[PDB]
Design a protein around this ligand. Structure first.
Ligand SMILES: N#Cc1c[nH]c2nc(N)[nH]c(=O)c12
Ligand SMILES: N#Cc1c[nH]c2nc(N)[nH]c(=O)c12
Ligand SMILES: [Zn+2]
Ligand SMILES: [Zn+2]
Lengths: 368, 368
């Protein structure tokens, strides 16, 4: 297999379906990436993640650099061996999380220093991702808070683009990395069209293997995110993957595919799983609700996951109410499976030229 | 398969190996029973429990009667369907737990009433076990606290024996239960030989499918428990299973088999698993200890479990230190697997007439 090859096998409007071939495996697109904080997809064995249909998972520069340490994981053989996932891993660069989780920060042109004292810069971020043995490396960016004035949004975007160039060069500098991994740039600009264009252009000029749409999962309502996607994704190179970071709910995902996005990540299925929220084709339910205490149906009536073929709502209800680990396990497995079944339905419907009808049908039921 | 058939296929000194055939399956003896509070073996899918080699698991009258409720589980189809375990289940009667976990109790000849207001009596305990669809029903007893004066120990034992007769008759009264399940009596008497004899005798006179040794897991040191086992187990009918309740550490188990016990249960492998204690043939280790942070070996060098073939100490160390659910999962799977491998080694060595040498060899290493 090649280092990186994105091929589009079918299209419908702005939506696309295909594959990314990399050395550790093939990624079917549009793709949902379970998130794996902190070298684990919470409450799932790797094999279980794979069984739900996941082709790739996300790891985080920020958390692993604090625990257990980037150099340590490198010493132990890389993230894949450490956690037992042998397929592609995309690592976020830390750009977001450093500002999100740190107890104290100092931002500067050089990078960000923080307490949880550490510095994170384009160079270090790319080095950490290297040490982890990431397959898809993210540029070190700044995720602009929402809302943002045009001035501050512009300043932030410009910095991110300078950091994008520094990320590129740091990646290319490391032969082993350049030859075996891929590098994705990250578009910023808040919700402003001219800034998103200048950002798209700076990224394309630098050149990346894929293009992420940053900053649209930090407060924007769906209508606003969709409006920004409407003009923003066509700015990106058509022949490269389009990754919407941090999105999202099943309906976010469907609308974003309708707008040209090929890759997604979100903690919602996992986190909300452990809190008792289960996704269904008729909308999300809270399994803790009293009305499920003697409900013998599965979580969802059509889901093929192992959880739905074996246990009832009533049981899972009991587990979560009891704070039992197996509840978290079952809820999470179901939710990730559901997300993967959604992606398959999306891929298949685009392949067959009936995606717009799928999206309409999905919405009708999900929102009923 | 018959309702109940215990056959002894080989012996060595007081130790025995064989099988219990029941309608839902065969139990290899000596047997370790993972404990399944509250309709779950914590952090394991049923299938995972089975894969470690478990033939039967323990459920608890006390906890399930409070949550989710005995009648409710009966409504939903019985404990086996509810939790997805289709093999034998032994249910404890509540005798122990009511006094152990309840917030307020009133003991009387009729039974125990408690707040966590509920009453538990021989009749209700047996009815609850029925409702759950238990395969091996335990008599409702009183687990005498340790230490105990001879007077109080005698009074407690006598009550337990009256309750044993009431348990027997309540069980026999329910045709469905009498025909498909088994009933085990429970010997009490504290550490006193004459009381253990009177108890053994009252139990044998009543007649049960198996005989448990109660009250030896509530403070007694090993030397004392072994001394009491030394005279107590020969008092029980030889041709019926001998169950030591609540025991124990791997070395407890080996010494108790040496004294004629065929069945064990304990929360140690599960609970201590989640707290970071892993069993090894060289003794238990605490995986949280700093010295495991870059240790690439498996939990144990010889263990065949899935955990030891796939993940390192270093990873599991990281998980538990991070309070990750997958740490609890992996630790628990390993620990139960280890317990089952111990039981297999015991069964095989008795079958081959080299159990006394196994026990000596085990102790030498484990205590090295
Ligand atoms: N919005 C949003 C984001 C979610 N994850 C992100 N990660 C990075 N590196 N940048 C981003 O803007 C975001
Ligand atoms: N010792 C001890 C025991 C552990 N579980 C028990 N369960 C019952 N019913 N009785 C017992 O004495 C004990
Ligand atoms: Zn499901
Ligand atoms: Zn193991």
């Amino acid at each position: 297999r090649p280092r990186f090859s994105f091929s589009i096998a079918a299209r419908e409007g702005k939506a696309r379906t295909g594959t990314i071939e990399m050395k550790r495996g093939v990624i079917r697109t549009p793709a949902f990436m379970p998130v794996g904080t902190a070298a684990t997809v919470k409450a799932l064995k790797p094999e279980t993640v794979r069984a739900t249909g996941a082709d790739i998972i996300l790891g985080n520069t920020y958390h692993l650099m604090l625990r257990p340490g980037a150099e340590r994981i490198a010493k132990l053989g890389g993230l894949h061996s450490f956690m037992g996932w042998d397929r592609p891993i995309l690592t976020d660069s830390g750009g977001y999380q450093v500002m999100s989780l740190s107890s104290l920060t100092k931002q500067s042109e050089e990078g960000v220093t923080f307490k949880s004292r550490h510095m994170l810069s384009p160079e270090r971020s790319i080095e950490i991702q290297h040490l982890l043995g990431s397959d898809i490396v993210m540029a070190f960016d700044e995720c602009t808070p929402y809302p943002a004035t045009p001035s501050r949004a512009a300043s932030s975007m410009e910095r991110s683009m300078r950091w994008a160039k520094r990320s590129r060069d740091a990646f290319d500098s490391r032969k082993e990395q350049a030859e075996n991994a891929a590098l994705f740039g990250i578009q910023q600009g808040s919700v402003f069209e001219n800034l998103r264009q200048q950002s798209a252009d700076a990224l394309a000029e630098i050149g990346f293997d894929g293009y992420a749409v940053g900053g649209l999962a930090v407060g924007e309502g769906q209508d606003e995110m969709f409006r920004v996607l409407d003009f923003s994704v066509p700015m990106l190179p058509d022949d490269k993957p389009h990754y919407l970071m941090g999105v999202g709910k099943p309906d976010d995902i469907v609308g974003a595919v309708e707008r040209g996005i090929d890759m997604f990540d979100c903690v919602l299925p996992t986190r909300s799983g452990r809190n008792g929220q289960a996704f269904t084709w008729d909308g999300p339910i809270n399994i803790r609700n009293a009305r499920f205490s003697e409900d013998l149906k599965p979580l969802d009536s059509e889901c093929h996951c192992a959880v739905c073929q074996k246990w009832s709502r009533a049981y899972i209800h009991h587990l979560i109410r009891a704070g039992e680990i197996l509840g978290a396990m079952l809820m999470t497995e179901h939710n990730i499976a559901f997300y993967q079944q959604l992606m398959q339905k999306i891929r298949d419907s685009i392949s067959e030229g009936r995606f717009s009808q799928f999206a309409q049908d999905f919405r009708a039921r999900y929102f009923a």
